[PDB]
Amino acid sequence: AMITEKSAALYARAVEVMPGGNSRTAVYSSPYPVYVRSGSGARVTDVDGVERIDFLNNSTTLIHGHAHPEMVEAIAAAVGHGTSFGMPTPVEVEYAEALSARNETFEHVRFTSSGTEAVMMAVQAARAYTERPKIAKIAGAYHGAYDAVAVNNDGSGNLISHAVTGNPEGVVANTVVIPFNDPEGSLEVLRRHADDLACVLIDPVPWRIGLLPASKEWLDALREFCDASGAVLISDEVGSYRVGYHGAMQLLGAEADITVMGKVIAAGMPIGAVAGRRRFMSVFDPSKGKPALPHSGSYNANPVSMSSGIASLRLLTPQAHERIGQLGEQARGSMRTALGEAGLDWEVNGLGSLFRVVANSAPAGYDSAAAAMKALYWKLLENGIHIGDSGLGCISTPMGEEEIAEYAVAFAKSLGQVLAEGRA
Amino acid sequence: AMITEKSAALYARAVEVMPGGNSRTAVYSSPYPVYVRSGSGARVTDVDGVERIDFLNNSTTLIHGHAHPEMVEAIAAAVGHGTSFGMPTPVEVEYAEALSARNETFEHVRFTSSGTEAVMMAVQAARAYTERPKIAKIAGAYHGAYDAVAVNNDGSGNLISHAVTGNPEGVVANTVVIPFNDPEGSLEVLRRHADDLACVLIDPVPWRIGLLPASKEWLDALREFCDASGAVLISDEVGSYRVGYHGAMQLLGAEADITVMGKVIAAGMPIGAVAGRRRFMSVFDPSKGKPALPHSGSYNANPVSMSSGIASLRLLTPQAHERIGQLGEQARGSMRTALGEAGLDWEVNGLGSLFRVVANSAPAGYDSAAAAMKALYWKLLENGIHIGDSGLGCISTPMGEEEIAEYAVAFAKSLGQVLAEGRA
Ligand SMILES: Cc1ncc(COP(=O)(O)O)c(CN)c1O
Ligand SMILES: Cc1ncc(COP(=O)(O)O)c(CN)c1O
């Protein structure tokens, strides 16, 4: 049924000018991905003219969906006045005030052009503040391509160092890994390295290891360890911030020293942020002599990304946050009903407006649970829905109960087709 | 004479929500920087309502100046269709075709959200391709905040390792440094490390060590060393690309394996690119199983930055490139005349549309040549001109003979005022 000839023709062009026709690993699918030309509200139109409901929203960036009129007005007005300057602007100050106001711990903020850069600068800040070399991160959790965090970042629960091809021992030896939600297992590792630990980098709701939240007991163990050792507690909320109105740590009853943000804070334009207590952020301050940690960047605090940010935070009201959490609960419940009626043991995890289908047992005719989840991703595309090819999804503010009901009908139909094709 | 009350008031707000009221080290000035609200063509209007001619153009990013109508149209129209997607778009293919066409060695390209990220991914690509740990870079050259390149990066010619506070030995020991334009001094270092060198990272026209071009002899020595050792030759042209129509290495008679680009290639929207021969770029290819080097990023190849890129490259015609080169030659000549008439030993370096005033001997009443250059930066601001506080500047395509003549008058007046204040 599905016509993808214009996607295939773009892919044939792309392979001549990009490696494997790709510029972003996460958006590649075999034999080629679907190419898209426009979005409006909750819906994306592909290059073959097919409109689908988007349930992943640029990897959970687009909390307000596609081309929200209030976002478009603010961004286009900023573009007209100049895209970037070699001087600070009023909107950087306005946006830092707006972001600082979201959480007590966001005393001072610094803007980058991505979450990948913001994670990197939060780790550099902790190393400059402590003058210690090691970082600790969660086994399996993903934090972007920066080489200190591109270690054990693939969903595995093993603690043995495993890094990207070429990441030197010089980097990999200074990143230690802790088991998620295992307080005693975590403290064993952290106590072994306490004298040398600059930071403990967590994600309170890491999607790559199943989108389960950090427990109170595990957050308490790490917060007490950081207070005792002097290690900086960094919460990477680039993806998970959206689960709470004041971010993920606040929802779970905890406080970070530094929080990394991105994605929803600007809801589509390039952004990252490092926010935390004044003392940890003081490594960046250039006002009293050379800073401990220089941090430049051509697009830092550019007024287009600041204007996108002001508009996003204005639209992300407590009422919007509540209503998308209602829709997330409706979506997760409809998926669990559909998986149980189909006779699969797969789980659906998530908080607020985030979810992830976590494939467990591979059904007949699939080599792995991940292959069965890729097949479900393709069947959902045929049935008018975009989700992540390993089960991630989210709600956008343009959605109502009708979109989630349409998704539930597509989800049940798709499961049926995946299972029937595996048995053929 | 100069009124900065609205800038002071923004700074007073900024210090409460950013470290030292700053989000980008390079745009800070004591006691506070000038804040700006808008740009049009070659001119910037500050928050106190004062219009000046911009001769630095967001650190040489804005090759087409501020809010170029054709740039504004392309960007604002792209925004209306969707700022970013979790799927590739037609404009990524169109822009990769446009950029690949600029140099024979740009066979395969990948997009990032910054030059800092692009440098990082080019170093990771060479380490993945060779499976060797070390990189070599130029003593003094700046490549952004990534910790492997944030070593010997502040204008010094010393080869002794000097890194940011907290950069661990595990990083710093794998970055070796070579003296710019010294073939035998460079080959001594590179031969000592040849078995362990993944790459030689250069900038062919590094502004931080005085904006002098790489010699034919030095580029030939490095190209031959890389061919012999299997090290990847990386040219970081994030700033220097603009000196030639086919980039900096081509102008100077050389070929890189990988070229890093940014800034002018999108002329004001967040961008970076890694462009090189197919074999080096193959580490990123996801089309034949898992790639050696995963490379994602929420804003990679976003259609707003791609649309900015297509418009910028379309506007950067051979005719435009020649005209800004002529204006740069006229500007450099007018500065050298003014410095000679004022009795300073200062030099003016640069190629094409780039220049740098290189302060040598401190005149009476200044502790250092750099303090004297900072004073000239402030006097130029008073006389209606923005340049860099250490002498960097550039020409933009909106400029004509009238802007370059106005600059020459302001430059001579400002030098007189700097010298008179130092002697007073
Ligand atoms: C937890 C986390 N941290 C950082 C990043 C990287 O952010 P960006 O895509 O803005 O570079 C991501 C992206 N998946 C993320 O999930
Ligand atoms: C040579 C060079 N490389 C890379 C960068 C970083 O690029 P961006 O500002 O886009 O991160 C810079 C910026 N100063 C640079 O000058």
Numbering used by the authors:
A (entry chain A), B (entry chain B): 0 to 423
Question: Which lines from the publication concern this structure?
Answer:
As part of investigations into the C-nucleoside formycin A (8-aza-9-deazaadenosine) biosynthetic gene cluster from Streptomyces kaniharaensis, we have characterised a pyridoxal 5′-phosphate (PLP) dependent aminotransferase (ForI) that aminates a pathway intermediate. ForI is a PLP-dependent enzyme from the biosynthetic pathway of the C-nucleoside antibiotic formycin. The predicted active site of ForI comprises residues from two monomers, indicating the dimer to be the functional unit.
Incubating ForI with l-Glu shows a rapid change in the UV-vis spectrum (ESI†). Residues Tyr 141 and Trp 206 are slightly displaced, Arg 207 switches to an alternate conformation. Accompanying these changes in protein structure are shifts in water molecule locations. These structural changes result in the pocket adjacent to the cofactor (bounded by Ala 25, Thr 60, Tyr 141, Trp 206) enlarging further and becoming more open to solvent.
